[PDB]
Amino acid sequence: CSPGIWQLDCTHLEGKVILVAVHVASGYIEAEVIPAETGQETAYFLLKLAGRWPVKTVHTDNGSNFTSTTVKAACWWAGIKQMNKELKKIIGQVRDQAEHLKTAVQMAVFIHNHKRGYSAGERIVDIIATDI
Amino acid sequence: CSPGIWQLDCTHLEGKVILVAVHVASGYIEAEVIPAETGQETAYFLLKLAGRWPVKTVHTDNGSNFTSTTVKAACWWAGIKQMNKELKKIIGQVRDQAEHLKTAVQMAVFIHNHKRGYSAGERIVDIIATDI
Ligand SMILES: CC(C)(C)O[C@H](C(=O)O)c1c(-c2ccc3c(c2)CCCO3)nc(-c2cnn(Cc3ccccc3)c2)c2ccccc12
Numbered sequence: 001c002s003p004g005i006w007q008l009d010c011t012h013l014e015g016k017v018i019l020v021a022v023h024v025a026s027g028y029i030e031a032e033v034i035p036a037e038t039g040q041e042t043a044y045f046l047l048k049l050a051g052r053w054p055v056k057t058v059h060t061d062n063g064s065n066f067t068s069t070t071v072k073a074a075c076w077w078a079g080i081k082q083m084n085k086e087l088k089k090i091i092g093q094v095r096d097q098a099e100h101l102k103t104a105v106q107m108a109v110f111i112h113n114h115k116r117g118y119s120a121g122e123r124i125v126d127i128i129a130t131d132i
Numbered sequence: 133c134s135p136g137i138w139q140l141d142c143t144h145l146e147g148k149v150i151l152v153a154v155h156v157a158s159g160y161i162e163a164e165v166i167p168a169e170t171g172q173e174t175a176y177f178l179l180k181l182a183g184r185w186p187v188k189t190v191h192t193d194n195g196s197n198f199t200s201t202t203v204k205a206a207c208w209w210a211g212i213k214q215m216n217k218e219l220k221k222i223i224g225q226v227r228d229q230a231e232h233l234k235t236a237v238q239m240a241v242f243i244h245n246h247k248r249g250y251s252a253g254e255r256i257v258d259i260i261a262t263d264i
């Protein structure tokens with residue numbers, strides 16, 4: 001698709017919430033473990049994401065994710081308008097490597113983003129730079 | 133300089149620690165508030181950073197930052213070898229906008245990375261994509 005579209009979702013594992021953002025054009029993933037699946041967590045995460053990539057529009061598979069005032073506030077300020085099983089597959093394979101789940105998650109993001117025919121990491125920067 | 137070099141440092145504000153990474157070639161900043169200035173926090177942050185950008189070498193202005201086993205482990209796994217006052221200037225100007233310091237920080241990262249003659253945000257993706 002077009003280069004400012006991201007998709008946000010939460011997935012659950014070991015009683016914790018993993019917030020997963022996928023840049024739709026590239027497959028590039030950013031991800032964080034959060035304590036609770038709250039609107040404030042989504043708001044802050046959206047602020048972090050928009051300061052790093054040019055985020056125009058965000059989609060989700062759970063629309064109610066985006067109905068908190070806090071989320072709306074974040075999108076308003078950052079100018080935002082409205083392949084997780086592979087990620088869960090990589091987590092499972094490296095989970096023994098690490099104590100904390102959050103560490104396994106960032107390992108899995110690293111593998112995913114740098115697996116190649118280019119990697120999701122190389123596609124996002126080419127896509128965004130072409131756009132400029 | 134060359135396109136895989138990052139600089140890590142901590143700065144302090146309101147009794148909290150702000151961990152600041154600057155991509156030296158571009159001026160592009162990634163940043164997080166952390167509870168304590170510990171090696172484990174630096175390790176995890178380094179894991180997050182390497183899964184998003186191609187990080188070859190990291191520098192710091194406090195070398196002892198990098199002597200924990202945990203940090204060394206992170207750099208080992210991710211294949212890593214060994215303009216904060218402007219950031220603090222932006223934080224100060226937007227601090228009233230937000231409750232939490234961490235929110236002001238990501239606001240300040242957003243402003244910095246997207247201020248333009250291109251922005252630090254546009255320079256990093258052009259630099260990294262040229263490299264590929
Ligand atoms: C990363 C944090 C600090 C958040 O937690 C991890 C964890 O959750 O496992 C953790 C790590 C760690 C650090 C980096 C790392 C991995 C594990 C997994 C793969 C990628 O990079 N390490 C230690 C520890 C303390 N001493 N050592 C001897 C050592 C290990 C490898 C190479 C060289 C030396 C490792 C942790 C100790 C307690 C809690 C979490 C740890």
Ligand SMILES: CC(C)(C)O[C@H](C(=O)O)c1c(-c2ccc3c(c2)CCCO3)nc(-c2cnn(Cc3ccccc3)c2)c2ccccc12
Pocket residue numbers: 039040041043044047069070071072073074075076077078229230231232233235236239
């Ligand atoms: C972002 C988090 C959730 C971590 O904390 C912030 C904070 O630290 O200030 C916070 C925010 C918030 C959300 C996004 C945002 C800003 C502030 C600053 C500029 C950029 O984007 N908002 C609320 C709140 C609750 N109701 N509203 C009516 C509203 C405000 C603006 C536009 C539309 C509607 C805002 C917070 C409440 C409690 C604690 C932190 C909040």
